[PDB]
């Protein structure tokens, strides 16, 4: 009981007459609230993963990206990718993550070559046109596209780079069509013995064996955390709550307080109100523009009034400067409750008869033990 | 008499954090010493008046 909370703090069993300070009262936050800017200009995922035609892997596309929001819910959550693998994040975490430069590479390959698009591989696609670095920290999205890119005669529009003098570097692209020399002899003209034209075109036919069937690749390459952020995952937001204490967040202005509607008008560029103390006292809502007074959640000392333990074991409690209407969040049964300039007084009766001061309660009030 | 003042030494030093409050327990009785120093003044403002 509050009496024991004195005896504990005073480190005494019998207690003398008086008003005694104990632990402070402080209202606990009713819920957490998250207020962020609306998800707005989304990234060009419909033009990247849903572009009608893709490139050939030899001449692999590099669609640079900036100034947009990277919501992947219409991406990972859809079954249309038979091979989405991330290599340096949980694919779940992407919405709660941010990226520096972004480059969507887009092209077509054989399914039995999709494995060679993973980092640290060998085989003609890894060796001669597309080769991911051993520390690749993008993500890779690939899918069977037999039903889109196969042709009954074979789709020889799409093509790989079969011959190369040497095995290439990560993110090197080659548009050479010069004749490969498989022998020690020099090669001249257009063709000859051990002269080879260095490209070849895929026989993507709809009848092809699974693996042989064409597959669409997008590499979400991004180089990260060396320049200011211009693309990010969506910062999810939540309903506004009012006239209750809460842990708030507005645009990364994390804090705690009772939120109330403000009369303050902010000029169109502003978002926060700060005091003489430079402490935050108000905030704009970033969705439904209006100004809100932050009032820090109601708090104050608990003071236990008592006659001496050598007299009685009945006691009273002051919550210093708290309005009675806030105490019930906690003796919130009430029964004897009174509200005063000093605070909320609980466990005592009011009497119009002005006795001499006995135990001081402050702000014109004293208390005593009587018939 | 001047304005009576009183402080929650945990809420000033470690406001809304258990994590700091643990590191404050290491220092022991100092916060109550400060409280008494302020509670002494605050009784004497009534007494002066």
């Amino acid at each position: 009981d509050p009496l024991s909370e004195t005896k504990c703090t005073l480190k005494s069993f019998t207690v003398e007459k008086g008003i005694y300070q104990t632990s402070n009262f402080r209202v606990q936050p009713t819920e957490s609230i998250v207020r962020f800017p609306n998800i707005t200009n989304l990234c060009p995922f419909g033009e990247v993963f849903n572009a009608t035609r893709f490139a050939s892997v030899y001449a692999w596309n590099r669609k640079r990206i900036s100034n947009c929001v990277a919501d992947y819910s219409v991406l990972y959550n859809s079954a249309s990718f038979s091979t989405f693998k991330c290599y340096g994040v949980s694919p779940t975490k992407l919405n709660d993550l941010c990226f520096t430069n972004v480059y969507a590479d887009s092209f077509v390959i054989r399914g039995d070559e999709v494995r060679q698009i993973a980092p640290g591989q060998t085989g003609k696609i890894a060796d001669y046109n597309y080769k991911l670095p051993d520390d690749f920290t993008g993500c890779v999205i690939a899918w069977n596209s037999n039903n889109l890119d196969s042709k009954v005669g074979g789709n020889y529009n799409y093509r790989y780079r079969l011959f190369r003098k040497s095995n290439l570097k990560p993110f090197e692209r080659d548009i050479s069509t010069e004749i490969y020399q498989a022998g020690s002899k020099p090669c001249n003209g257009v063709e000859g013995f051990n002269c080879y034209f260095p490209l070849q075109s895929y026989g993507f036919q709809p009848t092809n064996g699974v693996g042989y069937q064409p597959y669409r690749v997008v590499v979400l390459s991004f180089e990260l955390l060396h320049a200011p952020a211009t693309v990010c995952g969506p910062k999810k937001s939540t309903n506004l709550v009012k006239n209750k204490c809460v842990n708030f967040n507005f645009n990364g202005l994390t804090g705690t307080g009772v939120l109330t509607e403000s009369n303050k008008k902010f000029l169109p560029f502003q978002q926060f109100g700060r005091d003489i103390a430079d402490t935050t006292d108000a905030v704009r809502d970033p969705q439904t523009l209006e100004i809100l007074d932050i009032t820090p959640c109601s708090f104050g000392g608990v003071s236990v009034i008592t006659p001496g333990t050598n007299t009685s074991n009945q006691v009273a409690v002051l919550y210093q400067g708290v309005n009675c209407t806030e105490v019930p969040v906690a003796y919130s049964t009430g029964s004897n409750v009174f509200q005063t300039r000093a605070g909320c007084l609980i466990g005592a009766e009011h009497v119009n008869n002005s006795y001499e001061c006995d135990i001081p309660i402050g702000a014109g009030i004293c208390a005593s033990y009587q018939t | 008499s001047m304005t009576k003042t009183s402080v929650d030494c945990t809420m000033y030093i470690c406001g809304d954090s258990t994590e700091c409050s643990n590191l404050l327990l290491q220092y022991g009785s100092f916060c109550t010493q400060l409280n008494r120093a302020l509670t002494g003044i605050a009784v004497e403002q009534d007494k002066n008046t």
Partner: peptide, 23 residues
């Protein structure tokens, strides 16, 4: 010409009307 951070100001036993009365 005349609460935050756990800092608080406590009211006097003798309110300005009682001071006006004693005076």
């Amino acid at each position: 010409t005349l609460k935050f951070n756990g800092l608080t100001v406590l009211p006097p036993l003798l309110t300005d009307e009682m001071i006006a009365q004693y005076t």
